[PDB]
Design a protein around this ligand. Sequence first.
Ligand SMILES: *Cc1c(COP(=O)(O)O)cnc(C)c1O
Ligand SMILES: *Cc1c(COP(=O)(O)O)cnc(C)c1O
Lengths: 404, 404
Amino acid sequence: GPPTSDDIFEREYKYGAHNAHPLPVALERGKGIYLWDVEGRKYFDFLSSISAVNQGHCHPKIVNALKSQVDKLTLTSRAFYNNVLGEYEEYITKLFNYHKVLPMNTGVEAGETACKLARKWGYTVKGIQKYKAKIVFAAGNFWGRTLSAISSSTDPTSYDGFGPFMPGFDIIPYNDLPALERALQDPNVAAFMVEPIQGEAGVVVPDPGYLMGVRELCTRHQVLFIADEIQTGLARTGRWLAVDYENVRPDIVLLGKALSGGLYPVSAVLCDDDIMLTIKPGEHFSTYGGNPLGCRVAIAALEVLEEENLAENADKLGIILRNELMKLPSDVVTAVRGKGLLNAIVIKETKDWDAWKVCLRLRDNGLLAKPTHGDIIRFAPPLVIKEDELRESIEIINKTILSF
Amino acid sequence: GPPTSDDIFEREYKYGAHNAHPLPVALERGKGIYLWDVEGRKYFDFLSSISAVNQGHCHPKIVNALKSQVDKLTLTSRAFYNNVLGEYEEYITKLFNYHKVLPMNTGVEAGETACKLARKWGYTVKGIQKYKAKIVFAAGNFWGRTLSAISSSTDPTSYDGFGPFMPGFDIIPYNDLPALERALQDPNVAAFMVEPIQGEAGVVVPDPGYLMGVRELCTRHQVLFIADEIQTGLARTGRWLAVDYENVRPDIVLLGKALSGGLYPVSAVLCDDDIMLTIKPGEHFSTYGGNPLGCRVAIAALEVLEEENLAENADKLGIILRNELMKLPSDVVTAVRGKGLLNAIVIKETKDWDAWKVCLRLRDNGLLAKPTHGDIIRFAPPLVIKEDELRESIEIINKTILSF
Ligand SMILES: *Cc1c(COP(=O)(O)O)cnc(C)c1O
Ligand SMILES: *Cc1c(COP(=O)(O)O)cnc(C)c1O
């Protein structure tokens, strides 16, 4: 017969690095909100690959765009032009209303690019002395696992044993305007990079007015506001960008994950000419960045979000999810939080009972989720989920939680 | 009618960052060794997307692998297991003969991962005090454009305006064994990262015995030998790895680019257990790393290389290429170099005549190549090229050079 789930776990243990920490389920097929394991068991996906399959697994519009282009041309590198990139660039810049886009592959690559842009703008436009430029980050931040990314992390698991660390990165508390105002007194700060909602920190939602205050302070002190929307963007929270909730325009926007609906690693840095054009020809590139195959899948992925009105559906259904979760006993679920379909519960963890064990039983009962911490479980289904499917999922969540 | 080449160039100028320095040609289709522009003009590909399409453009076996998996499952993230990754891991580890592989997406991500491995091994196994670990690099090195990668560069265009820089990165001359020996006297050195041939530096091949000497020095001093085979590996130089020419076994091998045949961003870090397992569960992973779609194309990409005996081809045909190139007048072309089908020519550059000019005329005569420097031109056609195809290309190169 074919490999069992245990066969699959065992082979990876033998031949693969032990760098990940997966929930033990072994998936072989996905469609829409559903995943199937190698034994044929069916599950509601409530993780969406960390919000990278907002459009559902294997969306036929995005699949078709990939299959069509793969027969024509997949990669020239940046040594030559391809015919598709410009069409994607015009589309995405007009959608989000920035002059320009710089295409990258992974989320961390887009963050690296934003730091370089901020620094280069800092030195060549603002006039900071080389090499004294600072970038300010919020505690709890996550933007990937390069050496530079972990240098700004407050999570010991990401940075311990991996230094020495990149200089010029400062850390302040999240959701803390007085602290930003204090940090921005230093003329050498070029940018503040921040998530509108912190995903990996446990879906930490800042108070109303935070984002307007950040925009105000950054403008006041001539500092770039970089909004990392790699997890929160693209209809996930109920808008094109989570910053749309307070109608503020960051200087640089980062996109990734669901930019391709899961079909291809595509990320993007959006900003106006006065920031973008600080990087000159030859000063920054990658092999796969802007390749025609990725661009065709990103165009289709973005069109799906628009056409199916997934932002509106995420807004409507998320409030149902939160309100239903809030009905669970307080001696069990101590907090419910989120926006749109990016949500989390906090459980009253004991020594015998934690998020991991809850998630294992969830899995056994046909729903896949994963903790961010011993007491925090993230809930993020694909945005194509219908209300009846959500309520079926809610029933599974209730039954599971109350069975301990 | 459709866009012209100028249309395509102008749309990117308006809506895309000005960060690439491309040769002006607008490609829409690629099959095997051939590329077609938007006017329908046909070119020999003599760059292979910087050795990323060793297997030719749109190889039907790798295309089939993509089309087959895209309908099943494309992305779970590493929060869950997929059924394909382990099959890929067993296959690639047994092929190159290392215990384990850590999957990443882009080349620079593989390099960052290797630096993290070297540091954590440095602290936990070698006993270096945190955070005093050093990694040594060679002048002329290229491994990408993250902040960390540019912090090891000797190219001002990569690092200027982007500081401050990552500490703990030391630089010595390439092809210099005494310099390495002197650097490795410092017990806080964890690793030496080096290309067996430097691609971007202009196909700089080190003297016979260099790699054997690097291996000896690293072993003596308990330092990890990291070989970056992202450009040189996968049959490009006429072996599975350029390092095979001297029977040398690095501690860490980096693969990327042609690992997917240009169909998907896939990179790999290969090393044994005592190094790999210094990273513990949850300490390093990315969203798209190890996804089933990428793994399916990577297995097919590798099988093509093996099945079609492309290393053997690259070796025989590269000997012909260099032989014919050396027949050119010694005052116009000053040096010919390379291994397999990674080759370059150095030209007697004048005020009015340079590599860029030669490559513009080459393009006009139906052959695509790109300068590495004002006086250096790289030639790297896909490895599926037959002898008669190569000879036709050679006459086009011959005619063009002597047409000035
Ligand atoms: C996932 C994530 C990233 C990193 O994306 P990768 O593609 O995994 O490198 C960056 N920022 C945020 C907010 C993310 O959620
Ligand atoms: C191209 C290259 C890389 C980086 O590859 P990307 O996928 O463009 O990040 C790293 N090392 C070497 C030697 C390379 O040629």
